[PDB]
Ligand binder design. Structure first.
Ligand SMILES: [Zn+2]
Ligand SMILES: [Zn+2]
Length: 134
């Protein structure tokens, strides 16, 4: 049963790192990163806390530090999750006027072709203390 290369698992944006002790959350209408090449319909998705698979020879540790990555709705590791679905490590965000449809046309990033774009939030967004974009 032939198998092709796995679908790209990288977020288009840099990490939102939890450098403090606050739990990640956003007010309703906030959280979606800036993407000038996306429509109002596309402004919806989730932050997913990065999980550990196979990075640890001497460590069996990686970076104890929590890192959260944004994925548009219907894309990434939780592509099959509907908006609002409750899961530890998933935070849902949506701008006003967003459409509840998969953003397959944006999809995910392939690191071998494109670099991550710096995660930027609109001016005056309420971000919890200790969270910083990388
Ligand atoms: Zn940092
Ligand atoms: Zn679009």
């Amino acid at each position: 049963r032939p198998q092709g290369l796995p679908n790209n698992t990288a977020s288009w944006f840099t990490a939102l790192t939890q450098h403090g002790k606050e739990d990640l959350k956003f007010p309703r209408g906030q959280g979606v990163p800036i993407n000038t090449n996306s429509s109002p319909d596309d402004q919806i998705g989730y932050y997913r806390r990065a999980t550990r698979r196979i990075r640890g020879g001497d460590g069996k540790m990686k970076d104890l530090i929590p890192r959260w990555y944004f994925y548009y709705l219907g894309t990434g590791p939780e592509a099959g999750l509907p908006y609002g679905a409750n899961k530890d490590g998933i935070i849902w965000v949506a701008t006003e006027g967003a459409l509840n449809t998969p953003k397959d046309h944006i999809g995910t990033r392939n690191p071998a072709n494109n670099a991550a774009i710096v995660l930027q939030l609109p001016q005056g967004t309420t971000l919890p203390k200790g969270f910083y974009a990388e």
